Structure 1
Amino acid sequence: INGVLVRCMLNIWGVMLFIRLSWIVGQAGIGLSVLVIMMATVVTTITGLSTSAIATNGFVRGGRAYYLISRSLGPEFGGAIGLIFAFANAVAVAMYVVGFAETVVELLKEHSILMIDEINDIRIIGAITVVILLGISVAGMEWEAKAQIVLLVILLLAIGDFVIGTFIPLESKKPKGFFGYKSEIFNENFGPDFREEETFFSVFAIFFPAATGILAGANISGDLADPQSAIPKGTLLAILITTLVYVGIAVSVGSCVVRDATGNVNDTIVTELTNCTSAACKLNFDFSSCESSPCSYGLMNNFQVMSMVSGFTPLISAGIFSATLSSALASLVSAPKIFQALCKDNIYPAFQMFAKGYGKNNEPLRGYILTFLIALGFILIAELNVIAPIISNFFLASYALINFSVFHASLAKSPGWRPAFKYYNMWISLLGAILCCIVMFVINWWAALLTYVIVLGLYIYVTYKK
């Protein structure tokens, strides 16, 4: 009730927190953003209750995450969810690491230093980073147990430092959108003023990965040093804490940083008593009239608002490093584990090359190379705002699959289904599945369709390979 809790809590706080939440709230108002977070959290908690019901039905010996599912679910749903989820984690590696690389090139361009083709300097940085990350994962993880705790200490210190910065309204940040909890800054920030082409569901898709750390946080750490049936409590409480801190950070940054701010001491508080519609003039002449040209930063231009508000910004940057690298590595170790587990069962005998445990320990290698290559291929696409909707798609697909499969097995299944989680009925799981599918189709309907024909073909193969 402490190990997998910390694991999920690490997996969930990812890149989208420090570098995208300000974005989201800047586009979808302080109000509607809460609806975004609430939809995300209801999907996640439906899936959490369902996966809990899974984690409280079978034998006490939880072999492997995918093996746990295959025990508690048919090989059709088993292999489907497994493959689609391992792919989800594989692409998630690239998502997290490219967010990291983005913040690196940001903190670097802040200096005098520069690189070749920033839009692809991100690509070079991400490549070196994923190489070093694979090198970390393979050949050693004994230290990760103690490393996750220090990472979480760093991360919580970063969040607390952010909030402690909010209450400290330095005048030098007046040229930035930060103003320190003004009511009118909150008023003007409640209406969902969107931007160039984003719609509510585009923003939701961007945000959704920031709520996706639950299953691999819990299940992938099957056979935990803790009892198996402790997973649900920690998973759900972690969901609650993460979503609550999401809501808090959301409301705070919305009531703190204005929609746009061209940092210029010149364009400042000179205080000509004008018409004064927006909240900027309400504060002072600072951050006035970005409507003409694209301004530098503030809640809708730059993603560095979080690092801009807090005190001793190094701690916030360290928190970013911790979150992104940690989540990326967790996904990078969970994905090939699922691959090798599914392949050792030879459920899909086409990928019979289960990496043969090429190592002194049971360290798969073929899966590592595969997911590393996928991560590279996706890293090549730089703009995180386009990688993230794909992860959104695939994780929504995975969640739909899993909770729908629970719903289906609930339709009486001779295989020992017999779950135990309080509040784990079928109808809520069918609700979650319909929600997942609908939401997935609203965000790039054709991607969802293609995903579904993929899983259909998987059902075919699993149906006639028997």
Structure 2
Amino acid sequence: KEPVRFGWVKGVMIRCMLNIWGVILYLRLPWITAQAGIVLTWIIILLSVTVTSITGLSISAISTNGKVKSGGTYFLISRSLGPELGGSIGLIFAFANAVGVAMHTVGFAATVRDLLQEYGAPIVDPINDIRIIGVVSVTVLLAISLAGMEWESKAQVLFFLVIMVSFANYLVGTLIPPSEDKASKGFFSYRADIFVQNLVPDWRGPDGTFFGMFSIFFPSATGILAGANISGDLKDPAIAIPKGTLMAIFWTTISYLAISATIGSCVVRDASGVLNDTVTPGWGACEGLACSYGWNFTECTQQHSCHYGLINYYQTMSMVSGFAPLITAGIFGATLSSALACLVSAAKVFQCLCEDQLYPLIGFFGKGYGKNKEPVRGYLLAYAIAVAFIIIAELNTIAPIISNFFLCSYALINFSCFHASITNSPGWRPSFQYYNKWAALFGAIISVVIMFLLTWWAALIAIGVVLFLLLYVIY
């Protein structure tokens, strides 16, 4: 009974694309497009996908160096900077993945709760909705993931199809001439006037700055290592990991640019929401862009007190669409798939750390064999952390620390590549064509600059945890 192996389009490309896409695509990108206009939004996107392209090239170069087992992403850190930054960064990576599982299942449970609160009676508590729904969802994901690897692959293909259907729904919705309901909320079809008026920023509110929008977006463009954590479950990784990872990054960035450039030329940043604001012939004068189509939104701009339009209403994308519930389906598919990718990623790193002879820290976790060619001993450890961080259910303060645990790995992977390449390390001969030491050095420096720049105390906590593990292991 041979194990199942995957090609490059279902085992690498789909996984990375589905882990990069989140709910920022559906709830915040249309808002960032309004705060910062179109050109600066493109600049933010192209700055974010430059760090993850350099890390992508380093990962691709790592993959063409030989055969590495599923979850041996930190082996280069270990054999280039000693086996005590190997295990420490591996443990940080595999703990942050198992926390990201919870930070996604909570986001899915929030949507389920929001739908339940309108269509029927919820159960008594306002926040225990999230806890019960999150725990049930995590148990279902654990069950399907523990039933094999073909089943996880089929579920991921299903989520991909649902996301594509939501994209098509959006794109055919924007081409429909506006109805009164859609017009009165700020939607007109592709107009040249609304495109030009939206190319320049309009910073509004306490969080409306270029660095604020960069800090909102950047953590949702990472997630490129989801096809390299299962390196051993591919038919030939040395051709499948470079091409799959880079195609994922390319197509994700294209979809990020198209959505902003199209939503930025259909909706105005201010709208009333009440249909009694048509033009009255002889209403003195009106000030605003929308009069030339037949709508009068002066009271908003004078008083700054309406809830609709691109800059005020967070769910504009779900009202431009032809059929609204398909966008909710897209949100479900974009959140569950990220949770599943993170749960399969944290299992295959705990299972590599539990069988690492050179890092005996947690090698004592073995009681039951579970020999089904599956990491049963690495799934329960991830499940326990995932549930323990769903019971808390309040995770907006832990997000910076986890997001910096994920950049302490982007720094050490890139620096391990550079250090092994300048030292001429004995056994480091990557054959990937597009790779350079100085690009890796730049990536390793920027990944620390950004990490301290986003929030300075969480970066210190992230460094302190790694340093404590390092020192306790040495002594």
Normalised by the size of structure 1, how large is the TM-score? 0.88
Whether contact under 8 Å (2:19, 2:224) holds in the other structure is yes
CA shift in 2, pair 1:345/1:13, >3 Å: same
Distance apart, 1:329 and its partner CA: 0.6
Instruction: Give the structure 2 partner of residue 101 of structure 1.
Output: 109
Moved more, 192-201 or 89-98: 192-201
Verify: 1:63 aligned to 2:69, yes or no: yes
Instruction: Give the structure 1 partner of residue 24 of structure 2.
Output: 16
CA shift in 2, pair 1:27/1:130, >3 Å: farther
CA shift in 2, pair 1:67/1:102, >3 Å: closer
Alpha-carbon deviations, 1:273-311, whole Å to 9, x = none?
64524x444544365544546544443444322222111
Whether contact under 8 Å (1:356, 1:364) holds in the other structure is no
Could you list the runs of 5+ residues in structure 2 that have no partner in the other structure?
A: 1-7
Verify: 1:185 aligned to 2:194, yes or no: yes
Whether contact under 8 Å (1:205, 1:392) holds in the other structure is no
Moved more, 233-242 or 75-84: 75-84
CA shift in 2, pair 1:346/1:201, >3 Å: farther
Distance apart, 1:153 and its partner CA: 2.0
Moved more, 67-76 or 323-332: 67-76
Could you list the runs of 5+ residues in structure 1 that have no partner in the other structure?
A: none
Bigger Rg over Cα: 2
C-alpha distance in 1 between matches for 2:296 and 2:330:
29
- Letter in structure 2 aligned against 1:299: L
Instruction: Give the structure 2 partner of residue 44 of structure 1.
Output: 52
Verify: 1:79 aligned to 2:79, yes or no: no
Whether contact under 8 Å (1:8, 1:218) holds in the other structure is no
Verify: 1:435 aligned to 2:446, yes or no: yes
C-alpha distance in 2 between matches for 1:449 and 1:27:
31
Aligned length: 461
CA shift in 2, pair 1:282/1:435, >3 Å: farther
Instruction: Give the structure 2 partner of residue 197 of structure 1.
Output: 207
Instruction: Give the structure 1 partner of residue 332 of structure 2.
Output: 321
Whether contact under 8 Å (2:73, 2:229) holds in the other structure is no
C-alpha distance in 2 between matches for 1:205 and 1:54:
29
Verify: 1:305 aligned to 2:316, yes or no: yes
Distance apart, 1:124 and its partner CA: 3.7
Selected match of 1:250 from 260, 265, 278: 260
SS at match of 2:227: helix
Whether contact under 8 Å (1:18, 1:320) holds in the other structure is yes
Verify: 1:135 aligned to 2:143, yes or no: yes
- Letter in structure 2 aligned against 1:65: G
SS at match of 1:218: coil
Alignment RMSD? 2.9
SS at match of 1:317: helix
Moved more, 64-73 or 418-427: 64-73
Instruction: Give the structure 2 partner of residue 403 of structure 1.
Output: 414
Distance apart, 1:355 and its partner CA: 4.5
SS at match of 1:170: coil
Whether contact under 8 Å (1:393, 1:443) holds in the other structure is no
Alpha-carbon deviations, 1:69-89, whole Å to 9, x = none?
347644344324322222232
Moved more, 384-393 or 405-414: 384-393
Whether contact under 8 Å (2:175, 2:189) holds in the other structure is yes
CA shift in 2, pair 1:384/1:266, >3 Å: farther
Instruction: Give the structure 2 partner of residue 176 of structure 1.
Output: 185
Distance apart, 1:36 and its partner CA: 1.6
Verify: 1:232 aligned to 2:231, yes or no: no
Verify: 1:34 aligned to 2:42, yes or no: yes
Whether contact under 8 Å (2:96, 2:405) holds in the other structure is yes
C-alpha distance in 2 between matches for 1:225 and 1:373:
32
Alpha-carbon deviations, 1:193-229, whole Å to 9, x = none?
2423354333323222322221122333434134433
Selected match of 2:469 from 451, 454, 458: 458
Moved more, 403-412 or 326-335: 403-412
Alpha-carbon deviations, 1:26-66, whole Å to 9, x = none?
33332222122111100110000001110111x3x332232
CA shift in 2, pair 1:425/1:192, >3 Å: farther
| Runs of 4+, deviation exceeding 6 Å | none
Moved more, 175-184 or 358-367: 358-367
Whether contact under 8 Å (2:99, 2:389) holds in the other structure is yes
Instruction: Give the structure 2 partner of residue 220 of structure 1.
Output: 230
SS at match of 1:217: coil
C-alpha distance in 1 between matches for 2:272 and 2:126:
22
Instruction: Give the structure 2 partner of residue 424 of structure 1.
Output: 435
Whether contact under 8 Å (2:70, 2:230) holds in the other structure is yes
C-alpha distance in 2 between matches for 1:119 and 1:274:
49
